[PDB]
Write a protein that binds this ligand. Structure first.
Ligand SMILES: [Mg+2]
Length: 293
């Protein structure tokens, strides 16, 4: 009486501790998908991330910048693919994320610089998805849900556009910092330390593809309710982000490491002409595909 129910609870906890130790460690190698998938499925089993954090507060993050980097990569995957309730469980531990990035920000370590930039992205994701709960933290919504979240009030459309520009900036800063550490022959490399730094950009590419579609649609909605001369700064911000995004997707499309792991969409040669209302109907929604393993 009660022996099998106690043994089931103990086995769930043990599998979570083993998977966390095998995913998040100091080895200079990409996070193993088998172990990350077991953490994500655990969050669907308990409808939260409270078991994950009960063990993760014991990780010695200041001992190793590689350990801190792999911790950030697993948090990004848990936010995008875990149960929605993980967002609140993560907000409890916001200071843990802020303080590990602040530590590495004071040091010259190559991985530490990348961790500092990653922590700013993760804090922006947690804030954005608590403020705007119509958007899951993996950012995928139907056109119908995007239209409802934008609504008809120019004040709500304006605020959502500024916040999505800030979100895209945090994503592109991480891709740019990773690429600055890897030289041109990274395109035909399978070096473990290269894979360790490239692997998180699979999550970054999926976030960015969604943010690009949403910001194009919000920018055409603003051009229909405000004078063209009040929106020059917004067009200037969009144009600079578009050229950074196009250069990121093109360079990532050239990596051997990514060939079997992600199908990256083609973007147009230049940004849409927001001054011509009829250009909205010529916009193609980019669609990322993850191929069979
Ligand atoms: Mg428990």
């Amino acid at each position: 009486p009660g022996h099998s129910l106690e043994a089931e609870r103990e086995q769930f906890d043990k599998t979570q501790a083993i998977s966390i130790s095998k995913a998040i460690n100091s080895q200079e190698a990409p996070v193993k998908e088998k172990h990350a998938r077991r953490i994500i499925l655990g969050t669907h089993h308990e409808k939260g991330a409270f078991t994950f954090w009960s063990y993760a507060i014991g990780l010695p993050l200041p001992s190793s910048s590689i350990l801190s980097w792999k911790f950030c990569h697993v948090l990004h995957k848990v936010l995008r693919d875990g149960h929605p309730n993980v967002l609140h469980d993560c907000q409890r531990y916001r200071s843990n994320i802020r303080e590990i990035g602040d530590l590495w920000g004071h040091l010259r370590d190559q991985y530490g610089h990348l961790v500092n930039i990653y922590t700013k992205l993760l804090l922006t994701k947690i804030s954005f998805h608590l403020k705007h709960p119509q958007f899951p933290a993996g950012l995928e919504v139907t056109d119908e849900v995007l239209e409802k979240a934008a609504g008809t009030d120019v004040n709500n459309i304006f605020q959502l556009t500024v916040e999505m520009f800030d979100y895209m900036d945090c994503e592109l800063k991480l891709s740019e910092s990773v690429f600055r550490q890897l030289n041109t022959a990274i395109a035909v490399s399978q070096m473990s330390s290269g894979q360790c730094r490239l692997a998180p950009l699979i999550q970054v590419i999926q976030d960015c593809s969604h943010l690009y579609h949403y910001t194009v649609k919000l920018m055409f909605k603003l051009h229909s309710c405000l004078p063209a001369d009040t929106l020059q700064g917004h067009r200037d911000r969009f144009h600079e982000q578009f050229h950074s995004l196009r250069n990121f997707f093109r360079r990532a499309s050239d990596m051997l490491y990514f060939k079997r792991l992600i199908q990256i969409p083609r973007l147009p040669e230049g940004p849409p002409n927001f001054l011509r209302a009829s250009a909205l109907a010529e916009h193609i929604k980019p669609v990322v595909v993850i191929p069979e393993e």
